[PDB]
Amino acid sequence: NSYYTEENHGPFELINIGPLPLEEGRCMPECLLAVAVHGALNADKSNAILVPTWYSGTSKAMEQIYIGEGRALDPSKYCIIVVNQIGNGLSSSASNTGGSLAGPGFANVRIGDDVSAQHTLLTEYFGIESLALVVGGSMGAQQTYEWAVRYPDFVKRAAAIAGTARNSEHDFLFTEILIEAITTDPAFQAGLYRSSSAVAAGLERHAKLWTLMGWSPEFFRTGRHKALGFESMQMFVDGFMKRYFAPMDPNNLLTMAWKWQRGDVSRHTGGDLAKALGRIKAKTYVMPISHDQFFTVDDCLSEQKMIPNSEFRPLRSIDGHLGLFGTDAQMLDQLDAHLAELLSSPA
Amino acid sequence: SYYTEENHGPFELINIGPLPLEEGRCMPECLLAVAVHGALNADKSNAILVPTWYSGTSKAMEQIYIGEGRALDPSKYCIIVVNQIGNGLSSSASNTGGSLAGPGFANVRIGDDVSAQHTLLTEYFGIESLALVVGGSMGAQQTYEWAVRYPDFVKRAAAIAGTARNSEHDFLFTEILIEAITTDPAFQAGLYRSSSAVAAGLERHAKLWTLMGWSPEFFRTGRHKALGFESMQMFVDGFMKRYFAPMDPNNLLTMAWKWQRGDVSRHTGGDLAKALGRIKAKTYVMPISHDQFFTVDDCLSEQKMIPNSEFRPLRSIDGHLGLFGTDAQMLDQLDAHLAELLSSPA
């Protein structure tokens, strides 16, 4: 109630896209998307770039790290549109919706529902017929693939950073343990808690589990956490990891976790992944992180070989998956060089 | 009901007497579960010591590594498998009475195991030197402790998938493994009357091992399918959960606490190089290529401090839990290495 505000996540505007029928059967009476727009559209509206948010992240995280005038995502050249996930606290979520969708009563939202909402937003409010580039990380990458598969003609270029088209079984288990880290807390009360802080024990265990998988063994072996200003592992868990998840809402995290678990573009073909990825007509750069523990390089390489006219351009960083937070300046330089080449490539 | 001779036999119980522990407390009587394979020769120079690993017993070692066609040959060597203190077979929280019963069981360290094993080998078997000390994971931690504590006693050493000093990343991993059990209300701070009552805690423990015990490439290539499981879900239940289900939470916590604090540099005051420099044995540091917490770079860092050692890593995508003998090729690599080690002069 105090963390998901405009004082720490602004600027963004709320847009009502209307009723949204979800894949799981339930129908949201009204769906609100928190949107952050940087840069202006040109005459024919051909310089639009779509940027989805990742797990537990907002539009503020993306703009502070990747969006800038000296960056590949240049607002002086492109109209970068950052859409917050449904269930991340800023958009329509369990923490801000009333009625029978309040708290644990919030419906099961899938990746396809996010893209469906974003497609309505771009057409009914912006009047955009095509996207120059769709770029996202982790869960944002899952939405990137869904976009490129569901609306192949709509997407000119695609950039998936540290994310897969179909969520693996090993990654599924990881998220399941992440969920149980919270639901094992008696203070959770099946989502009927009166304070996200009350569920501190679940959130702290949630943070420690991310410490184990979010980075890499080489990250802590070389003392990278010490170079960030933390004298030890114990202090890194508290001062960085626990600090991050503490003011967040358990229900929202479970909402995004459920969606993360079932990220799969092959549902549009009935499980056939190769047939689904073959539908992609956009110029796609598959960019996994070298030391990612659950979104491994071999996973993404396996999927890239199914995408026509794509390129496998992995990022080198020992910071692992959570290198997306901009802890590695060198990794960002690699990303800028890749995206610039992508945006320079014809469509 | 699980820690019996029907599935861990055959082994003998030996009373080595009182054992003063490093944590201050003193066990009135310590019983070691010992499995002996092969006979000693005339001068008793063919003795091999094999420690057990986490949640494992002496039965696991003999079923996988000990055999006539193997490097650990009972027809040539007297392989002595000693069960860890607190693994259910030896003196544990589940079989000791008095003030050491259940959660009242003392904090046992790696040095306490080796101290007990040294007392056993000299005062009861009359063995003056070991031809080889070989172990995996926690067994490797005891191997390093042996090579440092008693440098003249150990002729050869083989540490598979284990480090001399436990890292922070490995420490955290074990800490989460413990909390997987202690988050269960049925645990009752170790005052449960049935290990089965804590099934929910044990199941989360098993799933967490599935995430870290193997590797992402293990499940990607369908290696779990070749083991007889059509899916991940069917592998977690039929293999992993099946394994930890009949085990005792307190025993697992005892060995976890010991695992967390595996460090030979306590004998030198934190100086690891000075501790590893004490080793006079021929040492093979053999980490597994896809180990997630006992990484290759961790062991490589420590191998460069050990005099007259060799860095001979094992390649297997099965990860750390390849020690269960799931990878036939990894066993071939290990046998070739151990055979060359035992063939090397002393």
From Swiss-Prot, chain B:
Disruption phenotype: Inactivation of the gene abolishes growth on 2-butanone and 2-hexanol. Mutant accumulates ethyl acetate. The keyword Metal-binding does not apply. The keyword Hydrolase applies. The active site is at S137 (nucleophile), D291, H320. Signal peptide: none annotated. It catalyses: ethyl acetate + H2O = ethanol + acetate + H(+). Belongs to the AB hydrolase superfamily. Acetyl esterase family. Homodimer. PANTHER family: HOMOSERINE ACETYLTRANSFERASE FAMILY PROTEIN (AFU_ORTHOLOGUE AFUA_1G15350), HOMOSERINE O-ACETYLTRANSFERASE. This is Ethyl acetate hydrolase. It comes from Pseudomonas veronii. The gene is mekB.
